[PDB]
Design a protein around this nucleic acid. Sequence first.
RNA 1: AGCUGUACCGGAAGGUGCGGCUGG
RNA 2: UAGCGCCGGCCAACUCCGUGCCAGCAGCCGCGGUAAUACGGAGGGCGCGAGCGUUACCCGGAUUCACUGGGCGUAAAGGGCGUGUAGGCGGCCUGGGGCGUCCCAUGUGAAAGACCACGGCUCAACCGUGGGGGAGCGUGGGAUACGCUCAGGCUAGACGGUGGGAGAGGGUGGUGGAAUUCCCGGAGUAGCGGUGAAAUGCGCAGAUACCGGGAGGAACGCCGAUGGCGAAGGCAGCCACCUGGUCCACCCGUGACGCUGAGGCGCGAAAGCGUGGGGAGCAAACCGGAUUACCCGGGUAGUCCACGCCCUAAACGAUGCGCGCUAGGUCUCUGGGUCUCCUGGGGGCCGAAGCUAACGCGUUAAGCGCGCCGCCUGGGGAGUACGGCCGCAAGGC
Lengths: 220, 138
Amino acid sequence: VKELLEAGVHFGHERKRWNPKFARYIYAERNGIHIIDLQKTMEELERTFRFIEDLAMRGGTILFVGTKKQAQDIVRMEAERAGMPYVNQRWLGGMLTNFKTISQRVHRLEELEALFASPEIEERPKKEQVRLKHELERLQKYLSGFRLLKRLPDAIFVVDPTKEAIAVREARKLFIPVIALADTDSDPDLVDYIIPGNDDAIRSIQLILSRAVDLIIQAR
Amino acid sequence: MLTDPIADMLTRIRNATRVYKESTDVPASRFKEEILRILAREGFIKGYERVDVDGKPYLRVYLKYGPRRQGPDPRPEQVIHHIRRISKPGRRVYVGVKEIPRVRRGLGIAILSTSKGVLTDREARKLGVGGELICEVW
RNA sequence: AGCUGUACCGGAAGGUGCGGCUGG
RNA sequence: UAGCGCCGGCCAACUCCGUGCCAGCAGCCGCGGUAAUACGGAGGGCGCGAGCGUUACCCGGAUUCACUGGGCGUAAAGGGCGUGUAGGCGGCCUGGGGCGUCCCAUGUGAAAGACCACGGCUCAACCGUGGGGGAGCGUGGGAUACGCUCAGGCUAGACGGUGGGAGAGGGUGGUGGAAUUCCCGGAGUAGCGGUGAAAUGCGCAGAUACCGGGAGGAACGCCGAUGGCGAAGGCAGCCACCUGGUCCACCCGUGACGCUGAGGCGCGAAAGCGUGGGGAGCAAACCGGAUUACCCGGGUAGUCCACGCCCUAAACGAUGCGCGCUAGGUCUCUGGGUCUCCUGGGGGCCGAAGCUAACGCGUUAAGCGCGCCGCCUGGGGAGUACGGCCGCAAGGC
């Protein structure tokens, strides 16, 4: 508490949206909103940070997922302030189950980036250059940050488990531990290490991600 | 109308376990208490407790589940996989000592209402008695 | 667009009257 | 002495010649109409072997009558719906009886056969000796958890009491207006009507369009809804009377009085029938006009009322009735409260777990269970034949 309280962490969704399986993390209902218990948040936060800190010392990597409009910037900033990869534009179907195929796209990106750093581009008439540049920029848009993954990650960090349900399903399929910042409308079962908080309110995302990243930093 | 209390209790337990509820409530009686006791020792349910709901005596059953599983469908494994009713109103099943069934090659239990109380198949075979075949659990 | 209970059919490759159904 | 059946798949075992939708094979699927591993022959091969095949019959496979061990929303299968007799089944606590139930002992359960162990025929088949098993009954003794019975209690099922609520629930009387048709009176003249476009038809005996009065029959616009009520069928103007069902609150009374239900008894759209009325509009059959039906103009039954029959359906949510348990979200009709909300009862959509061949169902289950009833057993012939019951008949079961 005393940091989570003023961050709007405890501010859940309305009664129209809540998942009954999440009722164990609910404290009370006020003014048509669900209030998330904060002591349970503290306990779960402690547990998840213990896991994260152990993983950080061990040497594994964490993939920072999250593509909500108000979460993209925070995800990118917190991820870049570490060696950790991230996805914040769009989750392509099969970034994990179809890792080899996406790695080919990564290689294409690196080769094109090398080519535009070369003076050998003066062939291939200007419009061919145009299409090549379009391909390159699309690749940078969708695969920047994902470039750091040389292999399968050791854990995944999902901003909204409901939003990035595809990523959660993939990670479940491949026995990859899932850490998620859930809210009232999420499924507590699918998350290995849950932080019952807020998925909206920039402030909450900022606080949680900042703390996690700092812990990773000092753990290394 | 409620025609069979014991089948009702078994169904209550099954329905509770299929949705991983930690506890269930059933209307209380001596016979149900005996069934719950036999289940309790064998370590199927966590344990039963006598309570009162609006003055009406109830039995509250605390259920047991395996550890949380890994990968897709992370729901924990069941301790009571299968539970049935053998002898039903309109068809009573009575077995002698010789005819006492063996369940899952000894992995599962069968509950008998013998003249010497409510027992398991093992206890009945030791005591050399038979009787009404209530249910089988595994 | 068909189907169906019932009742007729001396221009039945089927039609019409009174109701019902969507299995359009 | 060595034969017999097979060689497309099932099903172990493949090439050539002959024929060419022929001759023929076949247990099923099926081969043969020109290069047939399926027909006939040959060579090889496979399986049994003094035997090898075929036909007939029985069990299996067949969980394909499902006690072990099936099903009914759409594949065959929920009765058209109530009321209810026999039957089946039935809450909580305590005591008696030991009927079912369980156990011990004992008498039977002939021999032969079956099982086991030894033996005798040189082995085996066959046979001998010994031992045990055995469902089911009789007698004696024991136990009382469950079912039964008999007593004594309890209120969680069921039913009453008091207060209130909504409703096209049903029957009987009685009146309100709009509209169509017809008759009378007035005013006015050449078309009106109808179609995809036209015709038949009506009109100079004055039609259509207009105004006023009168007669009669049937149905009730707006509200009216994805609404409400009933067991189903089904039920809409309004008023009154008589009357059924149901919901809620209080938690006051009885103290298991309950659920289902083969027969029986009652209700049962429409279309039909009989005996009497009635008949405005519409309209089978029928009569005419255009263009094979369709469409247009007429028109009998019928549609309406009373009484008595008929008893069918896509009579449907294609889902029998009762009770209990299993996440929720949203819309709506109707009660109660401490009225942002909470708690009952109906009607709808989307969806947890689960179920399903799939579609889809999902607290209004087609989920998980218990009780009772009905029904299914491949298609066609066939709801046909005969028989029986019912009906005036059509026809129904």
